[PDB]
Structure 1
Amino acid sequence: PNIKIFSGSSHQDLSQKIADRLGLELGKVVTKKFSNQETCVEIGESVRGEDVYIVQSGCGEINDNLMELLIMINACKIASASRVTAVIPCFPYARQDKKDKSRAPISAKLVANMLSVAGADHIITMDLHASQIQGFFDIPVDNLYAEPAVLKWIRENISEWRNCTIVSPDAGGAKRVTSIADRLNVDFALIHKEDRMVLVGDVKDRVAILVDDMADTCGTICHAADKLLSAGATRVYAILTHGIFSGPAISRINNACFEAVVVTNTIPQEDKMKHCSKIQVIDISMILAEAIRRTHNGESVSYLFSHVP
């Protein structure tokens, strides 16, 4: 059983980077639309008895990409692939992980059920919005972390990183920032709203680094950055694993005081970089490629939680 990497249409550059790091060519697949806009998928090579990995992120036209992924999984499964793995760098509907006093769907659970029923045997993803989403599955889920790559970027790009403060934009992400603060041996601050925000932790004359899983409309991080500059911070960075940047995010970032907005490439960023000078991209294709290769060879994946490959 050999590795076969297939790309959905969502993030083809990431799939190519992963394939190069694995020393493989992308599997032959046609993924287009019929005239009535139904997804058309044709696997152009035999996957019989192979270990198939389908790379598709929850970005762009999310429902189209999700249906493409489900259809590709189904096609590979009924084509007698030995194992089918969904590599989903940004998990769609992850923020709908609970009801919370509303007659709302748990869309993340529905997506997990659909992936299971399509025939996925395994899920590889990066920085799930809530790690409880792992429990939405009955198949194994490897939730990778961008934190090693983030730490690497911080050390090689922020000269004052030993005196910086890692800041959570809200009370929800504090855990994450504390982890980073532990790995860098720096202070960590929290910010939460009472339209006013309150900040705990000295940030004067120090570089502040907001850290988060995602930036969708960037209202949260822009408000946090305004507060950090109010409290005497020297420069404010924002580091996010998922740069969705929908709606007014680009305009707000352009009008914000960030020195840089670093995001990983779990979502393609070329279009946003055109209209926003301060967006920078961390490659995480090495982490994804190593996770694929370790799941295939039966090596430890959790080794990657703390080690940059």
Structure 2
Amino acid sequence: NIKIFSGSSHQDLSQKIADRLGLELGKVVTKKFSNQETCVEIGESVRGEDVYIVQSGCGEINDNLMELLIMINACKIASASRVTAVIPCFPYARQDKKDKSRAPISAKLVANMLSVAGADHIITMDLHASQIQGFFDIPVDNLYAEPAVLKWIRENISEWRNCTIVSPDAGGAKRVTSIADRLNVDFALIHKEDRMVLVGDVKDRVAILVDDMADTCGTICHAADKLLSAGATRVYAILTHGIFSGPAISRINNACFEAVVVTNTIPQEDKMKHCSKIQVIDISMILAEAIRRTHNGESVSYLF
């Protein structure tokens, strides 16, 4: 009844999920014709089935989005009973408002496309902005890595009871005060005027930079420099989505991070060979459990 399919070549997360559910990944032929068009071909009947498509990680965000939309549509017109998009890192999430510019709200565009493609349900993790659930009219389950992150901090940072959770920017305030409050410790915040300004106390204490995602890491690496300058004993960086593109990886080694922790919402195995301070939190069990619970009418909010 449950059928799980994986996006293009990135399959490791998808395989882990299927394993936990006692399933094999559904048969599908996903490629790219010589002329760049995405080719998809569902290799088995999905009629009457509860279908979950786990987004890919072939890096190329537009190819991965189109492959997902095409797979959703194929399953819908092949009479699946329901189609859920499992998208650990939601594409174009940062493009979720105009920001005083004549800009697209591409996150809303992405939501409309998923909907017209035929998605009945979305499962995702740590939306850049919670309001993004409002971009849909279908149910969205937005899972949190927070519980996983707290666990990791307690278990890996000896001085954690007196650390400071630090936001790399002004916009990250809510996220870090949330974490600092759960741990009952201090928080502080960095803002780029450029020069960086720090508000809050970090002197002589472990500093943990926490962010929903890191891309070029230019901001997170500068922040690390600032924190050292302000006398933080040691600096960590905790990111739920480790995009790590461009100079990211070399900026990290080249930085003072005692470690950089991310989830496997994005494949990491390649960059871990090029960066020793990277540790990953496996979130396949959360995702698998969201799917089973989604399938069984069981509570998903428990995992929050």
Same fold (TM over 0.5): yes
For residues 177 and 271 of structure 2, the distance between their equivalents in structure 1, rounded to whole angstroms, comes to 29
For residues 221 and 240 of structure 2, the distance between their equivalents in structure 1, rounded to whole angstroms, comes to 16
> CA contact under 8 A between 1:3 and 1:52: conserved in structure 2?
yes
Deviation at 1:200, TM superposition (A): 2.3
Deviation at 1:35, TM superposition (A): 2.6
- Report the CA distance shift for 1:99/1:58 in structure 2 as closer, same or farther (over 3 A): farther
Quick check: 165-174 or 35-44, which moved more? Answer: 35-44
1:275 alignment partner, SS class: coil
Quick check: 254-263 or 156-165, which moved more? Answer: 156-165
2:51 alignment partner, SS class: strand
Deviation at 1:274, TM superposition (A): 1.6
Deviation at 1:57, TM superposition (A): 4.7
Deviation at 1:41, TM superposition (A): 1.0
**Which of structure 1's runs of 4+ aligned residues deviate more than 3 A?**
none
String of CA shifts for 1:16-62, please: whole Å, max 9, x gaps.
11111111111111111223221111111111111100000566011
2:273 alignment partner, SS class: helix
> CA contact under 8 A between 1:58 and 1:90: conserved in structure 2?
no
Give the match for residue 123 of structure 1.
122
String of CA shifts for 1:156-179, please: whole Å, max 9, x gaps.
111111111111111111111111
For residues 11 and 288 of structure 1, the distance between their equivalents in structure 2, rounded to whole angstroms, comes to 16
Quick check: 114-123 or 266-275, which moved more? Answer: 266-275
Deviation at 1:97, TM superposition (A): 1.0
> CA contact under 8 A between 1:33 and 1:39: conserved in structure 2?
yes
Deviation at 1:130, TM superposition (A): 1.0
> CA contact under 8 A between 2:15 and 2:25: conserved in structure 1?
yes
Q: RMSD of the TM alignment (CA)?
A: 1.2
- Report the CA distance shift for 1:270/1:60 in structure 2 as closer, same or farther (over 3 A): same
- Report the CA distance shift for 1:135/1:57 in structure 2 as closer, same or farther (over 3 A): farther
For residues 57 and 133 of structure 1, the distance between their equivalents in structure 2, rounded to whole angstroms, comes to 20
1:241 alignment partner, SS class: strand
String of CA shifts for 1:201-243, please: whole Å, max 9, x gaps.
2212211100000000111111111111001111100000000
Quick check: 4-13 or 282-291, which moved more? Answer: 4-13
- Report the CA distance shift for 1:57/1:208 in structure 2 as closer, same or farther (over 3 A): farther
> CA contact under 8 A between 2:236 and 2:259: conserved in structure 1?
yes
Quick check: 193-202 or 270-279, which moved more? Answer: 193-202
For residues 137 and 299 of structure 1, the distance between their equivalents in structure 2, rounded to whole angstroms, comes to 22
- Report the CA distance shift for 1:86/1:153 in structure 2 as closer, same or farther (over 3 A): same
Q: Report the TM-score when normalising by structure 2.
A: 0.97
Give the match for residue 100 of structure 2.
101
For residues 125 and 262 of structure 1, the distance between their equivalents in structure 2, rounded to whole angstroms, comes to 19
Aligned-residue identity in percent:
100
Deviation at 1:135, TM superposition (A): 1.0
1:28 corresponds to 2:23: no
2:63 alignment partner, SS class: helix
Deviation at 1:291, TM superposition (A): 0.8
> CA contact under 8 A between 1:264 and 1:281: conserved in structure 2?
yes
> CA contact under 8 A between 1:58 and 1:89: conserved in structure 2?
no
* Aligned residues between the structures: 304
> CA contact under 8 A between 1:50 and 1:83: conserved in structure 2?
yes
Deviation at 1:191, TM superposition (A): 1.5
1:46-125 map, 5 Å: 46-57=45-56, 60-125=59-124
For residues 83 and 294 of structure 1, the distance between their equivalents in structure 2, rounded to whole angstroms, comes to 14
- Report the CA distance shift for 1:58/1:123 in structure 2 as closer, same or farther (over 3 A): farther
For residues 177 and 58 of structure 1, the distance between their equivalents in structure 2, rounded to whole angstroms, comes to 27
Deviation at 1:267, TM superposition (A): 0.4
- Report the CA distance shift for 1:128/1:10 in structure 2 as closer, same or farther (over 3 A): farther
> CA contact under 8 A between 1:125 and 1:141: conserved in structure 2?
yes
String of CA shifts for 1:88-142, please: whole Å, max 9, x gaps.
0011111111122322211111111110011000000111111111111111111
* Gapped regions of structure 1 (runs ≥ 5): none
> CA contact under 8 A between 1:7 and 1:54: conserved in structure 2?
yes
> CA contact under 8 A between 2:128 and 2:212: conserved in structure 1?
yes
